Amino acid sequence: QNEVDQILSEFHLQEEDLHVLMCRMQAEMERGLHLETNEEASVKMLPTYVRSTPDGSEVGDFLALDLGGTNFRVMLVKVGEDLEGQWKVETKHKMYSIPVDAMTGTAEMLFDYIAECISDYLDQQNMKHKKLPLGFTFSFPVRNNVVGLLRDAIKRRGDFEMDVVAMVNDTVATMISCYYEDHHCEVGLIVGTGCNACYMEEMSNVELVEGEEGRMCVNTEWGAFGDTGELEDFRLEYDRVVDEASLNPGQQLYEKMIGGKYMGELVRLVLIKMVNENLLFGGESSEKLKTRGAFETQFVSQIEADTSDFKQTLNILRTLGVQATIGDCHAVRLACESVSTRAAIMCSAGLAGILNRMRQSRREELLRITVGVDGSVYKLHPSFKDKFHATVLKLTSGCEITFIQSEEGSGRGAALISAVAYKMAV
Amino acid sequence: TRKYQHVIETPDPGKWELAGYEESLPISEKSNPMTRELDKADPSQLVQLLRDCDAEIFQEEDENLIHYHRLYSESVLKTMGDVAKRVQEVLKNPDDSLVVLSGCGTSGRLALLLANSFNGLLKGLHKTPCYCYIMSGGDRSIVTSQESSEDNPQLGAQELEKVCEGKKNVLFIGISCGLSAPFIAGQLDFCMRHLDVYLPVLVGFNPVSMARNERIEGWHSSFRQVAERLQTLHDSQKGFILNPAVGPEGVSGSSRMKGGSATKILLETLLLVAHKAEVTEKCLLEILRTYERAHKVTYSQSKKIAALMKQTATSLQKKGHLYILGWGTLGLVGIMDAVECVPTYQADWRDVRGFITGGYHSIENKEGDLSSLGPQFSISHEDFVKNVLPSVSETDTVLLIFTLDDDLNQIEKLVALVKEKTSNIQVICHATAGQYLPNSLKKTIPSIIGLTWPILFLEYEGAFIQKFQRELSTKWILDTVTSGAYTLRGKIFRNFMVDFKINNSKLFHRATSVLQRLTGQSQQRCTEVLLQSIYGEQTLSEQIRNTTIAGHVEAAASQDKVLPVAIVSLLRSCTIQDSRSRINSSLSIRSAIESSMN
Ligand SMILES: O=C(CO)[C@@H](O)[C@H](O)[C@H](O)COP(=O)(O)O
């Protein structure tokens, strides 16, 4: 009774603890934005091509790439004002036929032809050196990687230049997609298997881009928050066991606490802890439950959304090879509840730290801003979203936050961006 | 920093901006007041001093005080815009037109660098090359220092004519830091006698009234007279003189530093505008700001630079060598700093050597491969592995300069070979924000001078500005490392050189100038004791007293401790032989002067 409450209390965090977490996040953001200490900073704060600069570029400008069989579709997306000065987005495209030799040939000559099609259409539209945000959608026939191969193809030509940050990720793609429908959206967030965030930072604050005027989307890569030890007084023993047992010992610490990848693993370790203390399952678990990765993350989501009769809970634990009691299922649910709640409040602190930064940097006593969101654990997990929303609003005092989910049924990345852009054009 | 917007803090003016400060010498020959005691400074202090001298490059003038024209002056910026517009006309007609860059020593090597750079810029746009380079040597001077080939105004005018054969429009850019080189003087003279096809442009950092007014032996005019001729054409837009004052060098005379750096900054910025407009003041300031960014990034690694300096110093002390291995154009920049160690600091060519990826094919010199000319002309990585590598010891220091876009694999394996011979491996690594050094190289390398460069949204030209940033950054590091190391070795008296082989006219007049400032006697007596030391004879005859300076140079070229002996013999009254024995009995050349100083 009280024994299981003392075990699950290690995950609990007070409102004061969430405050230091978001302030320590802000410090790592500032450290990553500075050119001096960006090398050793845990949070890189990587600059992108998504920008609102006086050179004509706007948020929503995008070059979408889509390969399918032997067809290659380049899509030019440009946003701006019309005659009335009202917001407007345009869409253009062109089809290409991949040579049979290039399809069977090595990846080099594939991207060589790809880069050739890109250069050809950019010259035709006169935007070859505008450095537009890039995105790839692949679908080959049934018989650092993609950006690196495209860079090498452009280098082999040499008629234009591309950077390693040219290709946007799914987080940035979420921001742009939601921006097309709500232009107050200046923050992107994905809380799925992994966790990342992006926001519109003042150009003058970004020292990794030689520019002083305008704004630019900053891909934080904040999953590595705590890699330099500034999160050690927030990480429990279960978190350390998970880390050392992973494929990257010491990396992505923050992501391993709020991400869904090791959510089931954390619950499993806690369950085993209770079993060894004779608080669960009579003191013995099946050989299955004692194996790493046996307790899936989807299990956690289902148990948290189950009735009081524990229909699904009993069903899952039966599959794991354990006849659980009603009291056991209650203890397991609380364990699932404890881990997911910590993930929700810490992810809230991070986002609140970003929002508070923007508010302080834009000199507004009331920041009107929309946050685009996506991810399996945000969308599907029941109690997560509400606990998330409540905790930001509690920590973002001085901001009016609106949340909108990505358009379901359009996909991720470039596919999502292209679909929403085409919808706003028509 | 009030007039224009800057991104780097420059030192406040500035005693050298006063006409009363060493009026005998022109700006390029004056001693920098900031480094009055550079001879007694630890590694980190030397970095600070030289970082301040290079910062003086970006200083703007105060119009109300009426001093020298600086980099950020209305006239200087306007001149750059005018020359740029002339470059365009050359580029509009790639068939019959040609831009020619010419210089001596460092200026010559820089001319080659910028010529190939903008040739590759045009090649990227599928255009034909329009840039050619001319240097005193010629191409043998890319690996060896031929200072003697500077005093020939005839041979300069001929080579210029030989290159532009058949061309209808030629824009000539002669480079003299300087305004002293007869080679460049003869070329400008030849241009002004053929204004129908030649448009002369002089690049320097001394006022026209500070050029050498001494009659160039075996010729009709002095440099100042030829310059004043171009200045009359300048007011009529017929020719152009681009001479912003940049200030004295950290070690006086060493025009390979600020003079070289400013020349690279000045011309690249000028030419970049030409290709961009293919002209506003807004344009130049955008490009110049990136060079200021290059200065800030470079000296933010001052700790690492100081370590590399002391490391090279310890190597030289243990009779060791510094081997500079560079990738791409950074390899050529590595050579430019290695070649100037022989004449400046009286070093063997074996002491400091540079190599490039890969060979002369990357240098793109017009005379092709020169490897057959001797052992020192083998300058590729393959040549380094084949010949140099199996002989280096622990006391040697191997430096590597590359980017994060080079073959990281062939670099990784190269470290393994060098570690087999020596532990002293230093690495200068460039990177674009935000690409990061792999743990492979990071855990293999001891200490690394890493430089991160901000993203540039400057259209097609951004990529080249990036390259120029990396080249200039590497130069400053190599400039400071090499100069700082030999400073720690005791090759500098205060902030000027005392012991150097008089290999040309400028060095002869400089040796005279050194005698004038250490003693109180006139130029008459200084030339005497200098000649007394060169020919050894106490009482100069008449066959040598009426011999031209070019003859004295040919006689002083094979003499050691020329100037130091002449200094002591004048400082304290004694025979040249007595002065010569007093030096051999002293622990150092510097100590022989300080003891004779009082
Ligand atoms: O580098 C040096 C000295 O460090 C010389 O090789 C110069 O390159 C040469 O003196 C150029 O001549 P001026 O530019 O001074 O006229």
Ligand code: NA
């Ligand atoms: Na910036």
